[PDB]
Design a protein around this motif. Structure first.
Motif, PDB file in Angstrom:
ATOM      1  N   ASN A 235       7.533  18.177  36.000  1.00 19.14           N
ATOM      2  CA  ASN A 235       8.047  18.118  34.639  1.00 19.14           C
ATOM      3  C   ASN A 235       7.601  16.808  34.009  1.00 19.14           C
ATOM      4  O   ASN A 235       7.807  15.738  34.589  1.00 19.14           O
ATOM      5  CB  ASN A 235       9.572  18.219  34.612  1.00 19.14           C
ATOM      6  N   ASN A 236       7.001  16.888  32.826  1.00 20.21           N
ATOM      7  CA  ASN A 236       6.401  15.713  32.198  1.00 20.21           C
ATOM      8  C   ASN A 236       7.499  14.806  31.659  1.00 20.21           C
ATOM      9  O   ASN A 236       7.946  14.956  30.522  1.00 20.21           O
ATOM     10  CB  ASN A 236       5.444  16.134  31.090  1.00 20.21           C
ATOM     11  N   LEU A 237       7.927  13.846  32.477  1.00 17.71           N
ATOM     12  CA  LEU A 237       8.917  12.858  32.069  1.00 17.71           C
ATOM     13  C   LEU A 237       8.398  11.461  32.381  1.00 17.71           C
ATOM     14  O   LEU A 237       7.227  11.301  32.737  1.00 17.71           O
ATOM     15  CB  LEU A 237      10.253  13.111  32.766  1.00 17.71           C
ATOM     16  N   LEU A 238       9.241  10.439  32.239  1.00 18.18           N
ATOM     17  CA  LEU A 238       8.809   9.087  32.568  1.00 18.18           C
ATOM     18  C   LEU A 238       9.748   8.383  33.540  1.00 18.18           C
ATOM     19  O   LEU A 238       9.284   7.616  34.388  1.00 18.18           O
ATOM     20  CB  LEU A 238       8.648   8.236  31.307  1.00 18.18           C
ATOM     21  N   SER A 239      11.054   8.617  33.440  1.00 19.20           N
ATOM     22  CA  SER A 239      11.986   7.921  34.318  1.00 19.20           C
ATOM     23  C   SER A 239      13.328   8.638  34.334  1.00 19.20           C
ATOM     24  O   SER A 239      13.626   9.470  33.475  1.00 19.20           O
ATOM     25  CB  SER A 239      12.164   6.465  33.889  1.00 19.20           C
ATOM     26  N   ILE A 240      14.137   8.290  35.332  1.00 16.66           N
ATOM     27  CA  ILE A 240      15.515   8.747  35.481  1.00 16.66           C
ATOM     28  C   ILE A 240      16.411   7.517  35.511  1.00 16.66           C
ATOM     29  O   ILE A 240      16.043   6.481  36.070  1.00 16.66           O
ATOM     30  CB  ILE A 240      15.718   9.602  36.755  1.00 16.66           C
ATOM     31  N   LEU A 241      17.584   7.628  34.892  1.00 17.14           N
ATOM     32  CA  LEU A 241      18.565   6.555  34.877  1.00 17.14           C
ATOM     33  C   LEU A 241      19.792   6.974  35.676  1.00 17.14           C
ATOM     34  O   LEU A 241      20.067   8.164  35.829  1.00 17.14           O
ATOM     35  CB  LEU A 241      18.961   6.195  33.446  1.00 17.14           C
ATOM     36  N   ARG A 242      20.520   5.992  36.204  1.00 16.07           N
ATOM     37  CA  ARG A 242      21.692   6.293  37.019  1.00 16.07           C
ATOM     38  C   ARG A 242      22.669   5.128  36.965  1.00 16.07           C
ATOM     39  O   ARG A 242      22.325   4.034  36.518  1.00 16.07           O
ATOM     40  CB  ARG A 242      21.294   6.589  38.463  1.00 16.07           C
TER      41      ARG A 242
END
Ligand SMILES: C=CC[C@@H]1/C=C(\C)C[C@H](C)C[C@H](OC)[C@H]2O[C@@](O)(C(=O)C(=O)N3CCCC[C@H]3C(=O)O[C@H](/C(C)=C/[C@@H]3CC[C@@H](O)[C@H](OC)C3)[C@H](C)[C@@H](O)CC1=O)[C@H](C)C[C@@H]2OC
Ligand SMILES: [NH3+]C[C@H](O)c1ccc(O)c(O)c1
Lengths: 352, 107, 428
Positions: free
Chosen positions: A254-261
């Motif tokens: 999936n074309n994304l850049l980052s995940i936050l948590r």
């Protein structure tokens, strides 16, 4: 006399019966300035606020689609007197919008006030302040920790039940600017494409296993680059780790850049994980916006801010607050056993 | 009973006498780590005197083994904790407690 | 002079009414002086208030105006109210005496069996028995004699000089003030006998020996410096407070009469309410009846020393008081306290090895004083009545009314005896 030391302020002793907090826009400034002052609210008005917040939240999607200029924030854990500092640092909700990732309630003495303020602010502003769901918003954790007792002491338990019935409807994904993903925990092996979190219903208490429980409980490795995904964890013992290949494959499919948590407490307040070689932004970012967690760690919080394709981080600081006895004991229950013991000792000694 | 397993031991040339007062920053929990009280939630050390019986006997025979600066970790059994009666409000009956005392000074 | 007598009667009636209403309000309002004995006292106060208000002014008008222009019917009503009030008072006195005898001879049985409903039932029973005994013979005209001028006073509206039937006098004195008198005398004599014997039951003597061993000053009373003679009693934080609970007379000294009463407050079989009340009394630094914020902070400041900051202690005290106010006064009463505490089961932690319950010894001398005063005030009139039965009439008609007035005036003596008591004094 009436007051041995008077330099400390007095808590107002009159509740607010839905006539001043409302107008049906709710009044926010007076609600802040009265909750800032150790005030209180009537029971029926609290039920009205929480039910209205639930009604607005239920109509929201399951994977929120947010526009670009946001101000992401971490988990608070009941620190009301730092929640205001957050609001004065990252700009008041009038002009800028917020995306609250993590939990709010357990492990703090001012959690009911915090959730009341946040949900009134959500009622007034419905499309400029987005809330997400964390692991501490269940029936197990809250009863285990100091929230059920908090509602039982301050208010009636019916407020607690309404609060849970309204926490059970929050969204859980919150895509951001078609580039990021903003979850409270992390990925899950049963979730591979974004559409996979557009299907499951969020109106039930999280189980101990599965796709939902692994999105609010997961936790990444401390040694990204480890020799060869789905290794279990011991710190929680309830969901899976995930290494750099898992996040990289998720962001490649999936074309994304980052995940936050917003789980792992950071002494600097934030942490940018190993650099992604594909583009140049870190793949995983950890936020934490509760200074002096548990009042002992002496960390400092942080607040990410996304604007003009640039993430700039605002640091943070603690703030003083009033004092409550552990588990909300009044002084009579606090010191009566000691009184009895000392009286009995003195008498059994004087008689012989 | 009570067992001291130090974490960051310090100087051992000073030991608590019977007639002195010990100042400690205790951070207690239950057996499962659920914190119920701490002396860092307040900015104030806890001062207690030996011989006189006000602290639970686990402290009396578990803090005596320490020295200056020797952070420890106490595992108080129900025999030396509040015991069968327990404590109203906080501690349920038949509780095993875990403390993180740290002796700092003696006066 | 006439004006002086009128002023005296007006003052007497005002004093009687005011004192009796004050006693009734003091018992009814504070909700703490609501013992069954206090309910009997309320019945007695109602009786003598009725007699004061209704009888005394009108008898005063009769003795002043020298003509009684109120009516034959009104005369019958007035004399019958008079007889009713006297008989009711004398019967409730012996009811109180027997109640106290049963309460002293076996505390648990009286504590369990007798309830508020039984008190109301017995009060109404005695009141209606006396009321029947007073109304029934008067209205049916059993007392009018054959002497012609007595018949004239019966016919003439002005004259109400009571006139006996040479048989009504005997039957009423000996069904109203001679049977209850002897009963309330010997029952209460047995009460004193049992109290004196119980006070010396081989247990109090040991406490007396220890008391005399602890009394260094040899002055017959214990001061605070004598209590800190005990090497393991000095370090106690809350020793001073307990002294101020034993020192109920306020003189600064504790003596054997109140040392045992203080210790007997704690027992293996003592009442739960007594121990809870003692726990409450630690916080009343002035015995005012309410826990202020200054009291609840100065009591806690001597236990926590300097382990909590001053501000933290003040804040938590404020929150406690704010969450405990169920009436908005700003100070906790005993009912609010027993709403907060109660369920902790702390009355089981205050135990001492003593086994004796000197609870029913605090209200024995005042009741004896009341009984003695009533007998002293009313017996001379009945003895003169029994002399005057016979037409010997050694001297009469102007001695006979002054004695009825000595009998009337005693109704003001009870409130003074009540205000001599400490709790009633602070109540007023
Ligand atoms: C104002 C009057 C109260 C007065 C309160 C203070 C000076 C403030 C002081 C920081 C206590 C804390 O108050 C915030 C709080 O500390 C706890 O949280 C705690 O971690 C604890 O277990 N500690 C504290 C550290 C020493 C060991 C133990 C203790 O022995 O404490 C002692 C204790 C409770 C003795 C019990 C009494 C009951 C008996 O049945 C039992 O006999 C077996 C022995 C303390 C020192 C008492 O001497 C003094 C007091 O109680 C308790 C869980 C509850 C306690 O509040 C009560
Ligand atoms: N005025 C009459 C006097 O009060 C009195 C009291 C009680 C009596 O049984 C009585 O005959 C007369």
């Amino acid at each position: 006399t009436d007051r041995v030391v008077k330099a400390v302020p007095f808590p107002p002793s009159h509740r607010l019966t839905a006539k001043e907090v409302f107008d049906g826009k709710p009044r926010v400034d007076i609600l802040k300035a009265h909750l800032m002052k150790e005030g209180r609210l009537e029971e029926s008005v609290a039920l009205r606020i929480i039910t209205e917040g639930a009604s607005i939240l239920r109509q929201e999607k399951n994977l929120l689609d947010i526009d670009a200029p946001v101000t992401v924030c971490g988990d608070i854990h009941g620190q009301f007197f730092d929640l205001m500092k957050l609001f004065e640092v990252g700009g008041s909700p009038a002009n800028t919008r917020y995306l609250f990732l993590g939990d709010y309630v357990d492990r703090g003495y001012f959690s009911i006030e915090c959730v009341l303020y946040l949900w009134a602010l959500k009622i007034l502003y419905p499309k400029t302040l987005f809330l997400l769901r964390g692991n501490h918003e269940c029936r197990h954790l809250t009863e285990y920790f100091t929230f059920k007792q908090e509602c039982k002491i301050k208010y009636s338990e019916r407020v607690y039940d309404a609060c849970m019935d309204a926490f059970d409807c929050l969204p859980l994904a919150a895509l951001m600017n078609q580039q990021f993903l903003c979850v409270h925990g992390g990925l899950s092996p049963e979730i591979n494409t974004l559409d996979d979190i557009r299907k499951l219903d969020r109106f039930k208490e999280p189980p101990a296993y599965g796709p939902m429980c692994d999105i609010l409980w997961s936790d990444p490795l401390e040694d990204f680059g480890n020799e060869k995904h789905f290794t279990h964890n011991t710190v929680r013992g309830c969901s899976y780790f995930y290494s750099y290949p898992a996040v990289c494959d998720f962001l490649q499919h999936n074309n994304l850049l980052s995940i936050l948590r917003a789980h792992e407490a950071q002494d600097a307040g934030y942490r940018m994980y190993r650099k992604s070689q594909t583009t140049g932004f870190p793949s995983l970012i950890t936020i934490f916006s509760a200074p002096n967690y548990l009042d002992v760690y002496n960390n400092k919080a942080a607040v990410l801010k996304y604007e003009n394709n640039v993430m700039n981080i605002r640091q943070f600081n603690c703030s003083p607050h009033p004092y409550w006895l552990p588990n909300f004991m009044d002084v009579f229950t606090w010191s009566l056993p000691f009184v009895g013991e000392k009286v009995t000792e003195m008498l059994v000694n004087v008689l012989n | 009973g009570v067992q001291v397993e130090t974490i960051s031991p310090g100087d051992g040339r000073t030991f608590p006498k019977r007639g002195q007062t010990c100042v400690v920053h205790y951070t207690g929990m239950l057996e499962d780590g659920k914190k119920f009280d701490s002396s860092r939630d307040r900015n104030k050390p806890f001062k207690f005197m030996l011989g006189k019986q006000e602290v639970i006997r686990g402290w009396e025979e578990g803090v005596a083994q320490m020295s200056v600066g020797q952070r420890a970790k106490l595992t108080i059994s129900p025999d030396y904790a509040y015991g069968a009666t327990g404590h109203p409000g906080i501690i349920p009956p038949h509780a095993t407690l875990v403390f993180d005392v740290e002796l700092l000074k003696l006066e | 002079w006439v004006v002086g007598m009128g002023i005296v009667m007006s003052l007497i009636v005002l004093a009687i009414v005011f004192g009796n209403v004050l006693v009734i309000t003091a018992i009814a309002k504070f909700e703490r002086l609501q013992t069954v004995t206090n309910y009997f006292i309320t019945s007695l106060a109602c009786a003598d208030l009725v007699m004061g208000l209704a009888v005394v002014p009108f008898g005063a008008a009769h003795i002043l105006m020298k003509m009684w222009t109120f009516g034959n019917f009104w005369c019958e009503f007035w004399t019958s109210i008079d007889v009713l009030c006297v008989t009711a008072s004398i019967e409730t006195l012996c009811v109180i005496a027997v109640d106290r005898y049963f309460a002293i001879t076996s505390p648990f049985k009286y504590q369990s069996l007798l309830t508020k409903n039984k008190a109301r039932v017995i009060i109404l029973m005695v009141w209606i028995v006396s009321g029947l005994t007073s109304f029934l013979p008067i209205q049916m005209h059993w007392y009018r004699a054959t002497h012609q001028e007595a018949i004239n006073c019966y016919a003439e509206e002005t004259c109400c000089d009571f006139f006996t039937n040479q048989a009504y006098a005997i039957a009423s004195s000996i069904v109203s003030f001679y049977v209850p008198l002897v009963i309330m005398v010997f029952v209460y004599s047995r009460v004193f006998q049992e109290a004196k014997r119980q006070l010396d039951a081989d247990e109090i003597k040991r406490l007396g020996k220890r008391f005399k061993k602890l009394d260094l000053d040899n002055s017959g009373s214990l001061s605070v410096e004598e209590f800190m003679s005990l090497p393991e009693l000095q370090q106690n934080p809350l020793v001073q407070r307990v002294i101020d609970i034993f020192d109920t007379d306020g003189n600064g000294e504790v003596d054997f009469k109140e040392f045992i009463e203080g210790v007997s407050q704690f027992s293996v079989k003592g009442d739960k309410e007594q121990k809870l009340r003692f726990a409450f009394r630690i916080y009343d630094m002035d015995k005012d009846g309410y826990i202020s914020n200054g009291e609840l902070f100065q009591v806690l400041k001597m236990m926590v020393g300097n382990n909590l900051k001053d501000t933290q202690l003040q804040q938590i005290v404020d929150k406690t008081i704010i969450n405990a106010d169920k009436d908005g006064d700003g100070r906790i009463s005993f009912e609010e306290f027993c709403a907060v505490v109660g369920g902790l089961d702390i009355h089981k932690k205050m135990v001492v090895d003593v086994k004796f319950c000197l609870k029913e010894h605090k209200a024995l001398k005042t009741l004896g004083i009341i009984m003695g005063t009533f007998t002293l005030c009313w017996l001379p009139f009945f003895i003169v009545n029994i002399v005057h039965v016979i037409q010997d009439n050694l001297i009469r008609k102007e001695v006979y009314i002054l004695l009825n007035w000595i009998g009337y005036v005693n109704s003001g003596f009870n409130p003074l005896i009540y205000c001599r008591s400490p709790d009633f004094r602070i109540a007023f």
